[PDB]
Amino acid sequence: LNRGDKVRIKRTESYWYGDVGTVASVEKSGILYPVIVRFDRVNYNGFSGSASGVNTNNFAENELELVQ
Amino acid sequence: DFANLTPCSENPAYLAKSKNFLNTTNDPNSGKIRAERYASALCGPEGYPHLIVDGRFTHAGDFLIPSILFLYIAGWIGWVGRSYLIEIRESKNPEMQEVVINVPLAIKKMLGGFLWPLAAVGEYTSGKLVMKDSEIPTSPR
Amino acid sequence: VVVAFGTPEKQILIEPVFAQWIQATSGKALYGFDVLLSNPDSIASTTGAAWLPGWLDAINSGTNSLFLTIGPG
Amino acid sequence: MQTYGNDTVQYEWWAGNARFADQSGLFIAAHVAQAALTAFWAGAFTLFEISRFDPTQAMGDQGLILLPHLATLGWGVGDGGQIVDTYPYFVIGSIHLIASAVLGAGALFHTLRAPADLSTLKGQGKKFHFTWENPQQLGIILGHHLLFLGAGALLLAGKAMYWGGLYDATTQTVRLVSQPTLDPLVIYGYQTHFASISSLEDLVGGHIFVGFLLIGGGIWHILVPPLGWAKKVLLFSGEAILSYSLGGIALAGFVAAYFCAVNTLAYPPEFYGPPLAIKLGIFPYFADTVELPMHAHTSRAWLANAHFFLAFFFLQGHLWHALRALGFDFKRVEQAFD
Amino acid sequence: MQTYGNDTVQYEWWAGNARFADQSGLFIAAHVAQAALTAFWAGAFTLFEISRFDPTQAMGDQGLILLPHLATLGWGVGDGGQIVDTYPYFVIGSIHLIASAVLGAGALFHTLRAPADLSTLKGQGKKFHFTWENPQQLGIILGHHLLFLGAGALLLAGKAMYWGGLYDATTQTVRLVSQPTLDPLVIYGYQTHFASISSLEDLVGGHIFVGFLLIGGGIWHILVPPLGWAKKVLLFSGEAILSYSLGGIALAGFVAAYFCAVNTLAYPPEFYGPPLAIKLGIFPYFADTVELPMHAHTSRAWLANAHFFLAFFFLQGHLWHALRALGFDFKRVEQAFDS
Amino acid sequence: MQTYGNDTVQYEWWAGNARFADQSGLFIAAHVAQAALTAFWAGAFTLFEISRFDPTQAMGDQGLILLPHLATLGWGVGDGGQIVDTYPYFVIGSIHLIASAVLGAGALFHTLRAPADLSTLKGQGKKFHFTWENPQQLGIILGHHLLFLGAGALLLAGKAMYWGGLYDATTQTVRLVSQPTLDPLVIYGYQTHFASISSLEDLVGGHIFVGFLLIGGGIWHILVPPLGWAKKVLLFSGEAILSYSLGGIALAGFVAAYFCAVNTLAYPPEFYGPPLAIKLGIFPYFADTVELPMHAHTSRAWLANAHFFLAFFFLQGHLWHALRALGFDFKRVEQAFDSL
Ligand code: CLA
Ligand code: CLA
Ligand code: CLA
Ligand code: CLA
Ligand code: CLA
Ligand SMILES: CC1=C(/C=C/C(C)=C/C=C/C(C)=C\C=C\C=C(C)\C=C\C=C(C)\C=C\C2=C(C)CCCC2(C)C)C(C)(C)CCC1
């Protein structure tokens, strides 16, 4: 989409399936998953005992619904 | 009817044991006051008060008055913790407000929780109490 | 804790009224409920069922384990 | 019958008795079959009560409801208030069982041989055709039904004054009521103490007044159509004409339950039981004065408490059908709660 | 209603009774149904108390509140202060219960058949349309209600000086009153000892002068509109007129709670019970001076303690609506406690 | 209030009562509702104590503090400390509680129908608009309140001399004060043994010469504006006038706690209870001579101990508002600990 412009993830395999994420950037370079979506909730990531996970993941345009 | 129970004023096992009630507190007549208060209940074969919770208003003080008193306070604790958590998530750093309590915001929410049932009914009607199930993070089935 | 502290009358003891009521609706008149089969004047009692003199004798004898008397424990 | 802004509305099978409200031939077929079922209950349960009648004990404590109605009429009560012959009760239930087959014949005639709508018929079938918008046709029907109800009330007074008389409770035997009651202020003064009607002469002259008024309204409704003020204030819908009759028979069911519980003349204690105190609890009911040995109830209380619940639920059925006639769909109540 | 500068106010379902306050046709339907429910309670619970009535022991210890009222009017009362007939209670209970069905039908008439606004109607429905800012029409409504309240007070004097006859709590009998008081000077002096009057002549003659006052005040509000000083002093909104009625009936409820607890004339001890002691604590409550066991309460303590608690919370409802009429949002309370 | 030169200071909800300072209309509504709440407590707890009073015991043993106030005032005692009337206490406890409803109504009047500032309206009410910079207007308010307090002190003079009397603990009677002592030499001599008084003529005569003093000062403050020396020495700010009153009411709370403990004329032992010994542990408390059982305290020991702790924290509240009126920012205490 565009920077800002919060979307809801429709990718079923993701941690954030049904969560609202903000689009960080779109890499229009022929990428399979060009949309960087930034979240306010970190996922299950990292070795055991880690205090936080990652909040960024790449998505395709078909996996996102505009909600903003 | 509770024919297997007897009132404690006419229960003979209670009467032989209410004269030896131990003083729980510093008042030397604590067990005698407990002997008078527990005499109105329904006692079993060995003189202990068997509470009735079926919904009878004769035994409303057994469960219903504890029910109304609990659900008011537990609804108060739940509402002011919910209303604090909604208020702090709109800030710049919502994470630090849970480990470091915004105490004047907490006192302001907690004193306003005496009208939680009229507030929970209002937020249910406004739709802000319950989120839509398609707007929630969901497991991949 | 209240039994340990010498005050067993301070125990929260709830009579299981809902399951004592079902014992009454099968015929046990020990609890004083007059409902269905414990009440001899109901339509369930007066239907002329041939189980009923044998069932009411067994449910009220107390020498069996048919419908045991239940309490707060 | 209602048509909430649309035509050809198909009713489901659980509300399947609403499709034939515009069908005049099927309207005759359902109602006469109801009268066939009603006359069957008057005949088969009279024989059922005869087969379960014991003259050793009281009639009202046994639980018979049709036989004390015939015993009040002056049939089989000729010696001491005790039943000695069941032949008058057998001859009445036999005619009712015969007339149930007669009414059941014409009911199945109208749903299988006669057409479902009588507008296609010719001759007298065009005159018998009715619809739920014609005022003058419904006044013909109402005046003709008022004539037989007036003749029904006059035949009771004809029975009570010429053909034996009724069971008078103040003398424990049948008596002739050949002297009538003519002064209308006695009847007009019975709007206060109608329950305590301890006078058989005042009851018979009342039915003369009812029987002559209902043939007066029978002649009036046949020869004169409904007027313009009656059409303005009363809705002439198929559900609405039902709604007036539902509340009208609920008022009759409440008064008949009040006559059943507390009267001593038309409901004698020798055949029904002692008069009943008007108790009230969650719902009003007429509790028994004395206990029963098998936790049963007397036949007077079985009549009065059932007719109270039948009149209340017919009042609620009047309320369902009046709000449907006026245009309330009951989905407006949930329409505001949002 | 109070707009708060909003022409199209919405109201949720918990405040859904505020939607028809500008609708005069639906204003009738919610008040006739209230009168249907009020006359049903006078009908059904008179007959409910007939089923729970015992000739042994008085009505005070039996927890009855309606059969004490009709017995003080002098219906079914023996010469020794006992109760001999439950049928005059049955007739009065039947009349109220059947008139509830007439009122229950007529409220369903105005709900469905009559329009929501009576300004649409032509004929006599056009005259019965009221707007809340029409003081001339409001006095016509108020003046006609003062006639029926005046005729209700004259009906009590017409029941005791005539056919009927009130009960006397001194000689314990039903006595028709003869030659009551008619002095305006002695009725100005009853403002002090109003709750300890103990005289049927003063009660009936009091009802004559307050019956003639409401009839005389009824014909003044009908013929004469509000003068202009009342429009300047009082407020004529939808909730403002309700505020005056809520405070007016809270003041009537506080006197009626006090009159039940201490007076013996209109509340005889052989029907209601002994006069209550005015106790106080976390709330003012009139406690039993004879202490019926097993939390029974002598049912004079049921009128006097409910009609104080009803009049207290109707005074708080008066304060709720007078604040809304004066222009308090009540959302400003939450705006005082914002960050 | 004090803004520290920040002009538009926004107070939070816990200091929300500082918002209606420098607003004349809401200043009336907060104080009339205080008088509504004060007269409600006078009315309701008189009837609360009537519903708790029994004449088998003493009045001081039951924790009753409002009924002995009315009994000392010269109302329905039976005979020599016996209390069998119970009706003039109900009349006083009902007059005060109906008056709280009138004061409760007038507080909601000035909240809503009257504006928040009285300078907006016109008429007689625009002369009631006061600011926290005007000595002429603030002295007009002070003069009229002195006239009310002076007439209240003269109301005790009229009650004792004419309308009934006062309960004399010396003679165990309620008597008219026929000849009060109008000598200013003996009243000026009562600076030392003010709380050791035992004569009703000295009490009533001392009330006359303060009732005339407050009325004479009330006429003085209305007619004469505050002088130039008082403007130089006293801060005429919003929080300064409060701090003068907080210090003034704390001094009265200490004197009234001392009058309650040791005096037997205005606090007779038949009603209030036996006189107190002024002990001191970590704070000055007042303890009884004889120990009332069941861990209960005498109602005199309840009045004097509470009115010292109220006067101590009202002195601490005076110190809070004096330093704020002086110019102490009170975040400097945090900034002193920040640097240290
Ligand atoms: C169960 C009994 C029963 C039933 C339902 C039938 C059925 C039928 N008969 Mg009838 N019929 C019967 C007994 C019965 N009949 C007997 C005993 C007689 C001699 C007295 C006749 C003489 C007879 C004649 C003369 C004619 C018929 C004809 C008819 C048909 C039209 C109805 C009519 O006008 O006559 C109905 C006549 C009755 C006497 C009705 C008796 C029905 C009672 C009420 C019994 C209760 C019904 C029972 C529960 C069965 C339900 C079936 C149904 C509702 C589904 C109908 C299908 C007509 C035709 O042309 O058919 C070829 C016609 O003209 N029948
Ligand atoms: C105030 C916040 C709050 C609220 C309103 C909810 C709401 C919910 N909880 Mg709970 N819960 C919370 C705190 C909260 N919880 C926390 C702190 C934890 C960790 C202990 C949990 C752990 C949890 C479990 C494990 C379960 C629930 C479940 C549920 C549901 C049943 C209600 C209940 O009593 O559960 C019981 C809740 C508890 C036993 C924990 C309550 C912890 C304290 C007492 C709550 C208040 C603490 C907080 C610090 C207050 C903040 C005040 C503020 C001014 C600073 C309900 C949707 C159940 C569910 O999903 O059912 C549908 C379930 O299985 N919750
Ligand atoms: C003289 C009686 C009368 C008449 C002729 C009508 C006519 C009509 N009603 Mg009904 N109505 C009335 C009275 C009447 N009603 C009463 C008394 C009630 C209150 C309960 C109602 C409430 C009502 C509703 C709620 C509805 C109607 C509707 C209907 C229509 C179709 C009904 C149908 O298919 O039955 C089908 C019948 C059944 C499925 C059988 C149900 C049997 C129940 C369980 C009761 C069983 C008896 C019970 C145990 C008591 C026994 C009594 C004992 C003495 C034997 C039809 C136009 C419908 C309508 O107009 O909508 C289009 C509709 O929805 N009626
Ligand atoms: C003569 C009585 C009178 C009138 C006609 C009005 C009319 C109305 N008020 Mg109300 N009000 C009054 C008395 C009155 N009130 C009193 C007594 C209170 C104090 C408690 C208030 C306090 C008040 C508030 C707080 C509100 C209004 C508002 C409303 C409006 C809609 C309310 C609604 O939809 O109810 C719907 C009814 C319910 C949801 C039922 C609630 C039932 C409660 C919880 C229990 C009460 C009964 C309880 C079981 C005790 C029974 C005792 C008995 C057995 C002896 C409407 C203008 C609203 C407004 O501002 O208008 C927009 C609003 O918010 N009123
Ligand atoms: C005549 C009394 C008087 C007046 C009119 C004022 C007026 C004011 N003061 Mg206060 N002050 C006084 C007495 C007075 N004070 C006393 C006695 C104290 C000593 C404790 C102080 C100390 C004080 C401080 C420390 C503060 C003020 C401030 C304020 C302002 C806002 C107060 C507010 O909104 O709090 C609303 C009230 C609360 C939020 C309640 C607080 C909770 C406490 C603990 C309640 C006490 C409970 C206690 C147990 C009561 C029972 C006593 C006994 C029966 C057991 C306002 C101008 C504030 C200021 O400087 O202005 C900006 C401020 O911060 N004052
Ligand atoms: C009566 C009774 C009883 C019974 C009970 C019951 C049976 C109940 C039911 C109940 C139920 C079955 C319920 C359900 C529910 C559901 C749901 C759906 C819910 C919801 C909830 C919510 C929503 C919540 C919220 C909240 C609040 C309100 C506050 C706090 C916070 C929170 C958020 C938590 C008994 C026997 C015990 C006893 C006697 C009496």
Short mmCIF file of C-alpha atoms in Angstrom, two decimals, chain D residues 192-193 195-196 232-235 244 258 278-282 319 322-324 326-328 332 336-338, chain E residues 12-14 19 43-45 47-53 87 90-91 94 97 101 104 108-109 111-113:
data_model
loop_
_atom_site.label_atom_id
_atom_site.label_comp_id
_atom_site.label_asym_id
_atom_site.label_seq_id
_atom_site.Cartn_x
_atom_site.Cartn_y
_atom_site.Cartn_z
CA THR D 192 -74.28 -6.04 40.91
CA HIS D 193 -75.36 -9.32 42.52
CA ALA D 195 -73.36 -14.14 41.25
CA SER D 196 -75.77 -14.59 44.18
CA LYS D 232 -65.28 3.74 11.04
CA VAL D 233 -64.57 2.50 14.58
CA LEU D 234 -64.39 -1.28 13.95
CA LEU D 235 -61.91 -2.72 11.47
CA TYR D 244 -63.69 -9.26 18.48
CA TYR D 258 -67.38 -16.74 38.07
CA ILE D 278 -61.85 -16.78 45.01
CA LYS D 279 -58.20 -17.25 45.91
CA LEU D 280 -55.26 -15.62 44.16
CA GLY D 281 -51.59 -16.57 44.03
CA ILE D 282 -49.22 -16.33 41.11
CA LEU D 319 -54.45 -9.52 22.07
CA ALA D 322 -56.02 -7.46 17.58
CA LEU D 323 -52.43 -6.21 17.27
CA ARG D 324 -52.02 -8.26 14.09
CA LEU D 326 -54.28 -3.18 13.41
CA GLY D 327 -50.82 -3.56 11.88
CA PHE D 328 -48.36 -4.40 14.65
CA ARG D 332 -40.96 -3.33 16.02
CA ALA D 336 -36.01 -0.15 18.88
CA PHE D 337 -33.58 -2.16 21.05
CA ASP D 338 -30.45 -1.25 19.12
CA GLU E 12 -30.51 4.72 23.78
CA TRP E 13 -32.83 1.90 24.86
CA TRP E 14 -32.17 2.43 28.59
CA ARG E 19 -38.31 9.44 22.89
CA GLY E 43 -57.06 -4.96 42.03
CA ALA E 44 -54.82 -8.02 41.99
CA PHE E 45 -53.16 -7.42 45.35
CA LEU E 47 -57.50 -10.22 45.96
CA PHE E 48 -54.01 -11.55 46.73
CA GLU E 49 -54.46 -10.35 50.30
CA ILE E 50 -57.94 -11.90 50.47
CA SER E 51 -56.41 -15.34 49.88
CA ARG E 52 -53.79 -14.63 52.57
CA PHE E 53 -56.26 -13.24 55.12
CA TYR E 87 -66.82 -9.47 49.98
CA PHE E 90 -63.66 -8.46 46.79
CA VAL E 91 -65.93 -5.95 45.01
CA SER E 94 -62.77 -6.56 41.25
CA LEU E 97 -58.93 -5.03 38.29
CA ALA E 101 -58.40 -3.88 31.66
CA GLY E 104 -55.02 -1.51 29.50
CA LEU E 108 -53.11 -0.05 23.48
CA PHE E 109 -55.55 2.12 21.53
CA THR E 111 -50.18 2.98 21.12
CA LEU E 112 -51.49 1.55 17.83
CA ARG E 113 -54.62 3.26 16.48
#
